[PDB]
Structure formats: C-alpha cells, structure tokens
Amino acid sequence: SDEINELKEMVKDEHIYDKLVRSIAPAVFGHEAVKKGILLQMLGGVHKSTVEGIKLRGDINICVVGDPSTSKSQFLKYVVGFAPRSVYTSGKASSAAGLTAAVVRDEEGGDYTIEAGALMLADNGICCIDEFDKMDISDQVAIHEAMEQQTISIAKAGIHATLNARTSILAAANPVGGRYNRKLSLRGNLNMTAPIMSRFDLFFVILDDCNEKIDTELASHIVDLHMKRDEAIEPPFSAEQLRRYIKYARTFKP
C-alpha cells in the first residue's frame, strides 16, 4: 500500500535497470559483467511447458573463473548475504551428501525421514559453490544429475525415493594453474568434465589487462577509502528494498 508507491516509482523510471546493475555489489569494484551475471540468476525464465512432453529450462547457470585475488568470492558472499533460500558451501568439503539427502534412518518409529540438505534445502534459488575443481569426480556427477534430469533420485539400503530440486548453481572455479593461459582454449583451462561444462551458460571469465579509465577509478576509489572524505560515494537503491522489488518482479509471467 505505502510501499507499492515505491514499486511504481521503480518501474516508471527508465534507468532503474542501470541502477540495479550499479547497486548490486558495493564491496566489489567494477567488472560490470558479473553484476548482471549475478542478478539474472535471481530472476529466472518461464521454466514451464512446452509439454507433451519434456519441460524446458528455465532457470540459469554461471561459473566465475579467474586468477585468485580477483575477489570472485565477494560476489558469492554477497549472494548468500543478500538473497533468502541460498546455501553456501566451500566444497572441496561438500563432502558428498551434502548436496543430496541421506536419507535419515532410523527415526525411530518407521523412519524414512529426510535430511535437508545442502543443495536441495535451497530450492527455486541460488546455490553457491566455491571451487568446482576441488571436489573431484564423485559429487560433480551428482550435480550433473541435478542439472540434467532436474530431479534428485535417492535410494539407500532402504526406502527408495525421488526428491525434486530445481535450482540455479553459481560456482567459482580456479584455473589449472590459477592463471591464463590466454592462448589455451577455455575448454582446456577450467578442467571440469564435458557434460557438466556444457550445462553452464555462460562463464563470465575475469582477466586482468592494462586499462586507464578503470585504473584511474581504482586509484581514485582506494585513496577515497583511506580518505575519510569523501567516502560519500554511494549507490542508488539500498539492500532491503531491492528484495521487495525483485520479489515483485518475480510475479510476472513474461
């Protein structure tokens, strides 16, 4: 009622897109790519129809890659901070399930009670995993089973089961040598298996190249930091309102 006025005020303006983009991750400095990369996961496709038949996707995926110290993790922490229904793991230590359900037995009194857990407890949402490259073979396959069949099938020494998880997966994956390798094919650089690779669209690799606009902006911004004044640099929308805005924007069937 009182807020809907604000929502209207948001949809009216022609810049609020740009406002979104610039206002996403204050901590992080620039890059402008992974800003969009992060937000466009929060707002997903129709993920519905086309029947008869098999259902389209729907949702989205991203895997950030780059030489360390690039603060690729700050994004992550910002997502687990900002959006509800978000799980954060650092796996390598997943360890296994982890991203799937146990299932819990016994209870007692009949059992078949199910652990949350990790990946699936975040549902219709954004799960954030650091370092795909550390978890080796075992679980990656499970993730593939999540992003291919879209369902999580669970049978262990007991009651058979099928549990749905419809999720977006944001990963941060370090290169083979933690570096480029510009000359190498990205295909060869990321070092995760082909089928899981082809399901992530798209990567938004971060690289360092000589620049002067951005350079000037860095020196300016850093000196600003150390300089109590002016630290008056700010963005547009806060962190609290952007949620109710988004949740509003979710109710549309584009």
Partner: protein
C-alpha cells in the same frame, strides 16, 4: 588345458609391427602358448558371397541347417556323439611315439633352430623354445589318440610338422611418428622434463583429440629406446 583368444591392438599395423610385443610389454605369454594363430575377418567376393548367401539362406525360407543333418545321415557326426567319443578316447588309450618319428623331429627342430638363428643374425625382430618342440610332440600324440592307436607313425607326424609350421608363419608376421614426436615437448617445452611427465603428455594430448595409453607409452617407450 587353456584355450585363449586375445584381442590385438590398433589392427593391421600390429602385423607391420613386430609379431610379438603385442601383449602388455611382454612376449613371454606367447612363449608359454604352444599354438598361436593370427587371424582376420578377411573378405573375398567369392567367400564373401558364400557367407552372405548362406545367411540369406539362414533367415528364411529357413532350411539350410538341414545340410548338417544329411551330413549326419550320410557321414558327419552328431556332436552329441562326438563328446561321448572324446571321453572314450581320452580315458581308454595313452599313445606313444615311434623312434624314426623322433629322429625326424630332431631334424625338424635343429633345422628350425639353425635356420631361424641365421634369420636372426640380422637382429630380425620377433620365439624358439624347446617348449615349442614339446608342443609338436603333444600334437603328434593327440592325433595318434585320434586314430586311437597305441603307436605313432611317421606320416602321422608329417602332418603335425606342417601344421605347426603354419603356426610359425603366424609367429613371423612406416610409423607416422606423429605422437612419437615427444621431442617438441622434451625440447622447448621442458629441459627438466619435470612438471610434465606422463601428466604433461595428457593435458597436452588430452584436449588435442589424441592419445591412447598404449599410444602414449609406445611413443614414450619408442622414444626411450630410439634414444630421443
């Protein structure tokens, strides 16, 4: 008594390759084995039409499998009987070779040894063991036990020598070097070889659409031996 069918690697080039050297890194297997038959799915329009036409007959109108049955009426053995027969001969009689056959096989084996040594003067890459001789023997007794006779004969063996000779012909039977061109890596890539090894060859040949385990080792062993 083991009867083994191995699968050879890379196809016809393994014949272009030394006849041994196939199984793992070691020919010793082939040394233990008495009769080694290199074979192939050879295709001849004559023979290929034979087999084909035979299959066309097999599907329908179906009635070819009768030839065996009239072979049974006239001559051939039902194979239900062959088994009983084998048991029979197997338990009843134990054959023994004749002396002239023996000396004949001595001549056989010394000609083998001498001639094929002369062949290997050039270091021709391939073998001869007294075990092979012993094999030839066991064939003679086997076939003697076919006739069921308590005693061997000369012609009887005369078959065996040639048969095993076909086996020797099987013992008897360039490379792009592309993969073998491990030089590029070893050089201008790694003077220390470290940080590479079997691992490097992979990443470098892993997404290069290219390298098999035997391929990688072969080219490696090759270059190891080649002295590169």
């Amino acid at each position: 008594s083991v009867l083994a069918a191995a699968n050879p690697i890379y196809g016809r080039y393994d014949d272009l390759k030394s006849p041994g050297d196939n199984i793992d890194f070691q020919t010793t297997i082939l040394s233990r084995f008495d009769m080694i038959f290199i074979v192939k799915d050879d295709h001849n329009e004559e023979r290929d039409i034979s087999i084909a036409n035979h299959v066309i007959n097999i599907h329908t109108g179906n009635a070819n499998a009768m030839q065996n049955q009239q072979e049974e009426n006239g001559s051939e053995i039902s194979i239900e009987k062959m088994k009983r027969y084998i048991t029979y001969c197997r338990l009843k009689c134990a054959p023994r070779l004749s002396p002239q056959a023996a000396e004949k096989l001595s001549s056989n084996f010394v000609t083998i040894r001498k001639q094929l040594l002369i062949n290997e003067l050039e270091s021709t890459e391939r073998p001869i063991t007294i075990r092979q001789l012993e094999a030839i023997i066991r064939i003679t007794e086997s076939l003697a036990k076919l006739e069921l006779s308590p005693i061997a004969q000369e012609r009887h063996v005369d078959e065996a020598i040639r048969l095993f000779q076909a086996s020797t012909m099987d013992a008897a039977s360039t490379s792009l070097s592309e993969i073998r061109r491990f030089e590029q890596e070893l050089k201008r890539r790694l003077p220390i070889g470290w940080s590479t090894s079997y691992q490097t060859l992979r990443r470098e040949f892993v997404d290069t659409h290219r390298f098999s385990q035997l391929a990688l080792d072969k080219a490696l062993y090759a270059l190891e031996k080649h002295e590169t």
